[PDB]
Amino acid sequence: KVYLPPPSVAKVVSTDEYVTRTSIFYHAGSSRLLTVGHPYFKVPKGGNG
Amino acid sequence: TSFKEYARHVEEFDLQFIFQLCKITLTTEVMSYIHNMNTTILEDWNFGVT
Amino acid sequence: TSFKEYARHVEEFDLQFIFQLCKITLTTEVMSYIHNMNTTILEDWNFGVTPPPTASLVDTYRFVQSAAVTCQKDTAPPVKQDPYDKLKFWPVDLKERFSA
Amino acid sequence: KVYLPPPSVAKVVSTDEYVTRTSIFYHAGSSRLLTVGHPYFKVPKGGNGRQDVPKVSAYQYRVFRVKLPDPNKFGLPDNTVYDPNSQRLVWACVGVEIG
Amino acid sequence: VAKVVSTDEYVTRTSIFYHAGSSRLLTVGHPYFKVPKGGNGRQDVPKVSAYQYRVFRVKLPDPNKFGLPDNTVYDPNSQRLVWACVGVEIGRGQPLGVGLSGHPLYNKLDDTENSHVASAVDTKDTRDNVSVDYKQTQLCIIGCVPAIGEHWTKGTACKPTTVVQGDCPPLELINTPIEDGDMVDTGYGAMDFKLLQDNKSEVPLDICQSICKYPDYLQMSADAYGDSMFFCLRREQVFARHFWNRSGTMGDQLPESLYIKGTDIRANPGSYLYSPSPSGSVVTSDSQLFNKPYWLHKAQGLNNGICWHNQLFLTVVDTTRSTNLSVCASTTSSIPNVYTPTSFKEYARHVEEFDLQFIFQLCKITLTTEVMSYIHNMNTTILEDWNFGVTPPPTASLVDTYRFVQSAAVTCQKDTAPPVKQDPYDKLKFWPVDLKERFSADLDQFPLGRKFLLQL
Amino acid sequence: IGCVPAIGEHWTKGTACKPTTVVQGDCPPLELINTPIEDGDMVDTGYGAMDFKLLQDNKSEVPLDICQSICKYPDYLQMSADAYGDSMFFCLRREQVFAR
Numbered sequence: 001k002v003y004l005p006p007p008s009v010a011k012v013v014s015t016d017e018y019v020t021r022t023s024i025f026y027h028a029g030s031s032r033l034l035t036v037g038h039p040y041f042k043v044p045k046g047g048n049g
Numbered sequence: 050t051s052f053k054e055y056a057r058h059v060e061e062f063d064l065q066f067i068f069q070l071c072k073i074t075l076t077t078e079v080m081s082y083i084h085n086m087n088t089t090i091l092e093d094w095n096f097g098v099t
Numbered sequence: 100t101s102f103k104e105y106a107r108h109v110e111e112f113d114l115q116f117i118f119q120l121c122k123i124t125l126t127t128e129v130m131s132y133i134h135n136m137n138t139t140i141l142e143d144w145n146f147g148v149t150p151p152p153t154a155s156l157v158d159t160y161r162f163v164q165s166a167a168v169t170c171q172k173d174t175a176p177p178v179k180q181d182p183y184d185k186l187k188f189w190p191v192d193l194k195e196r197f198s199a
Numbered sequence: 200k201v202y203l204p205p206p207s208v209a210k211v212v213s214t215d216e217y218v219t220r221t222s223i224f225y226h227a228g229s230s231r232l233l234t235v236g237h238p239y240f241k242v243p244k245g246g247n248g249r250q251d252v253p254k255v256s257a258y259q260y261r262v263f264r265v266k267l268p269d270p271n272k273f274g275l276p277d278n279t280v281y282d283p284n285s286q287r288l289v290w291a292c293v294g295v296e297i298g
Numbered sequence: 299v300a301k302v303v304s305t306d307e308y309v310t311r312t313s314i315f316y317h318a319g320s321s322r323l324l325t326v327g328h329p330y331f332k333v334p335k336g337g338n339g340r341q342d343v344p345k346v347s348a349y350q351y352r353v354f355r356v357k358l359p360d361p362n363k364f365g366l367p368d369n370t371v372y373d374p375n376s377q378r379l380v381w382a383c384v385g386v387e388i389g390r391g392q393p394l395g396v397g398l399s400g401h402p403l404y405n406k407l408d409d410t411e412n413s414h415v416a417s418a419v420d421t422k423d424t425r426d427n428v429s430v431d432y433k434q435t436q437l438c439i440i441g442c443v444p445a446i447g448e449h450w451t452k453g454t455a456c457k458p459t460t461v462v463q464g465d466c467p468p469l470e471l472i473n474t475p476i477e478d479g480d481m482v483d484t485g486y487g488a489m490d491f492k493l494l495q496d497n498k499s500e501v502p503l504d505i506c507q508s509i510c511k512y513p514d515y516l517q518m519s520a521d522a523y524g525d526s527m528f529f530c531l532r533r534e535q536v537f538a539r540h541f542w543n544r545s546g547t548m549g550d551q552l553p554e555s556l557y558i559k560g561t562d563i564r565a566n567p568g569s570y571l572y573s574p575s576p577s578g579s580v581v582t583s584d585s586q587l588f589n590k591p592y593w594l595h596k597a598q599g600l601n602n603g604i605c606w607h608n609q610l611f612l613t614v615v616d617t618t619r620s621t622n623l624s625v626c627a628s629t630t631s632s633i634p635n636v637y638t639p640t641s642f643k644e645y646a647r648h649v650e651e652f653d654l655q656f657i658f659q660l661c662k663i664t665l666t667t668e669v670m671s672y673i674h675n676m677n678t679t680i681l682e683d684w685n686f687g688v689t690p691p692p693t694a695s696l697v698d699t700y701r702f703v704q705s706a707a708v709t710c711q712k713d714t715a716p717p718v719k720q721d722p723y724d725k726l727k728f729w730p731v732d733l734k735e736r737f738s739a740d741l742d743q744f745p746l747g748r749k750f751l752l753q754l
Numbered sequence: 755i756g757c758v759p760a761i762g763e764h765w766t767k768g769t770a771c772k773p774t775t776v777v778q779g780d781c782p783p784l785e786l787i788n789t790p791i792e793d794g795d796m797v798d799t800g801y802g803a804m805d806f807k808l809l810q811d812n813k814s815e816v817p818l819d820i821c822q823s824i825c826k827y828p829d830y831l832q833m834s835a836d837a838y839g840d841s842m843f844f845c846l847r848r849e850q851v852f853a854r
Contacts, residue, residue, distance in 0.1 A: 152837060153837075155832060155835045156788075156829075156831060156832050156835060159786075163768065163770075163783060163784075165781075166768075166770075166781045166782065166783050166784055167768060167783065167784050167785075168767070168768020168769055168783050168784050168785035168786075169768055169769040169770050169771040169774075169783050170768065170769060170771070170785075171769065171771055
């Protein structure tokens with residue numbers, strides 16, 4: 001119980017059932033992500049941050 | 050002795066996407082079911098009501 | 100003096116039973132009255148609609164023969180056993196000496 | 200907003216009312232039950248599973264905690280009678296002859 | 299005629315479809331033996347080292363007598379009920395993994411492969427510590443019944459006489475049912491190693507005190523009605539890592555006639571027992587069979603995939619995961635700053651995880667008479683277990699039963715006497731598998747199921 | 755691929771539920787553990803999802819970068835056992851190895 005309980009019974013179903021598909025088309029994309037550092041350990045240098 | 054040796058690690062990266070957004074008409078039991086999956090979404094849609 | 104004496108009791112029983120099934124057409128307000136009466140049966144049937152979620156990935160053989168995790172495994176929750184299992188019974192599966 | 204009981208009445212009634220009856224019959228019957236020990240007291244003897252004489256007198260209440268078969272199990276669920284979830288299945292034991 | 303009936307020639311196939319699947323099986327122990335800790339419940343660390351034939355005695359429920367019978371679908375009275383599984387995806391545990399086994403007192407004459415020096419001392423007990431792997435291999439056998447491996451032994455010196463101590467016996471080949479945990483042959487001995495080597499001084503320790511088989515697929519393919527195993531899947535590879543000649547007395551002799559002699563050790567040539575070291579080769583994940591639907595259709599088996607008594611004998615091999623694991627545990631509660639191994643008690647165990655997953659079709663079989671009775675003559679037993687005219691049984695026994703125990707001193711016959719039909723494979727070890735609830739029809743909700751549905 | 759992060763599985767030590775000697779340097783008791791994975795979680799290499807240190811009272815006997823580390827292994831099984839894919843909608847794997 002809480003917040004919403006039944007009616008009615010039932011089971012579990014894929015979403016796709018209720019998915020209104022659209023024409024929506026996107027591109028989205030992240031260009032180059034980069035981060036570099038030292039293999040074994042972090043090199044502390046107590047800047048820091 | 051004249052030379053200090055150092056060890057450094059590197060990364061470069063790219064995500065690319067195509068979305069199609071979907072609409073879901075909320076109906077209550079569904080909503081509850083969705084709620085029962087996670088309400089938070091619904092709040093976070095604010096499916097409401099207040 | 101030449102004799103050591105002992106005192107014992109015995110009890111035997113066989114009950115025979117006749118059942119009848121009933122259906123419950125699960126009508127909502129009743130059901131919910133019944134939820135409100137108590138859920139748990141209802142719970143024990145329905146409601147597989149989200150959420151009836153669950154665990155997985157389990158079972159582990161000899162735990163522990165020696166050096167497997169000892170496990171205070173011991174996982175059950177309520178109900179009915181709570182309390183019933185605090186209580187003596189001659190525990191009875193009759194369930195399969197059930198004859199049509 | 201947590202129980203949640205709609206109108207009207209909201210007051211208990213007999214079961215039978217909503218009981219969907221069947222013709223269903225089963226016999227069920229307890230293979231033989233016996234249990235034994237010493238009346239006056241328990242003889243613990245350690246050794247230790249329990250390895251013991253339970254105190255078995257009989258002026259102690261006779262309570263069978265009886266586990267019954269789930270009727271909602273079957274089948275062939277397709278069956279005549281059944282629609283889950285329209286219906287759920289339930290026992291009534293109706294009859295007993297106590298040996 | 300003996301003429302196989304062949305399932306389908308009377309098994310009424312159905313629309314019945316079901317899911318089953320096993321949540322995780324898990325167990326750990328040591329790469330060799332059981333390290334006992336005096337027993338009994340349990341207090342031992344067993345072996346766990348999966349190079350053993352894997353037999354899941356796989357139990358399902360009686361479909362016959364599910365309960366309730368409008369019997370609308372069917373009259374059991376005629377059409378008694380049976381499972382057939384159709385589709386399987388066994389979900390397989392773990393990363394992939396690998397390991398080593400050896401023998402400190404592994405003999406050797408020499409590393410005659412291409413020794414750097416070719417020294418050859420003639421002193422005994424130079425048998426040293428060497429470890430190794432085997433043939434990279436995945437196999438599974440599926441059946442209604444268990445399986446048979448075949449393996450050797452020092453066979454009967456069935457010559458009338460008897461003979462010399464240390465003389466070579468004649469060697470006899472033996473078939474045996476494979477059982478759960480049965481040790482695999484790995485590349486070296488569907489036979490009794492332990493028997494074979496008087497020395498115990500050779501091969502990896504694990505097999506020293508061993509016997510294995512190789513699975514008798516061929517006879518098992520030659521199956522009486524295409525049952526036992528009605529399905530089988532197999533995949534194996536290897537190469538030779540390094541070469542030796544063993545040390546040991548040649549229990550026979552070399553012909554001279556092979557050479558112009560030399561001087562000394564060359565006049566008298568040394569051992570002729572040449573011996574390699576194995577290895578399975580590289581692994582890629584790609585070659586793992588596991589985790590896909592094997593939908594079956596037609597099969598080899600003329601039982602097309604059914605189990606009476608609800609037992610399927612799931613038989614399996616995987617080389618992709620071999621390790622028992624090392625704990626360096628300090629003897630000291632201190633952790634010293636100068637490390638000595640001696641401050642550490644070091645320990646070895648391997649661990650194994652599993653899922654079987656299924657799509658069944660129960661099928662119903664109408665009782666036909668000079669055929670049912672043939673089935674009796676196939677084997678009655680099932681049929682008994684589906685019974686029919688007159689059980690028979692016995693009331694006085696039936697009543698009696700469960701009374702005793704709620705104590706252990708009061709009555710102390712303490713279950714000396716049993717009651718079974720008996721599975722002979724009682725004397726055999728299974729991984730006891732039951733699934734009488736993995737039962738589902740939630741194909742959708744079943745990984746495989748989804749596929750299966752999709753497979754439609 | 756998921757809308758929600760995911761779970762690894764990795765190894766620990768079990769319990770030895772009593773003073774099971776508790777020897778200093780005893781055999782450990784052995785337990786299997788799942789953990790959710792974060793961005794940058796350390797991996798299996800083909801070697802061991804566990805704590806290392808846990809095992810090795812030496813810090814002297816594994817590849818050093820992972821010496822005093824702890825790792826997980828992907829619970830693919832689980833995540834295949836996911837209720838809906840929000841950990842795993844998709845899953846992909848490719849690994850190859852031999853022993854040098």
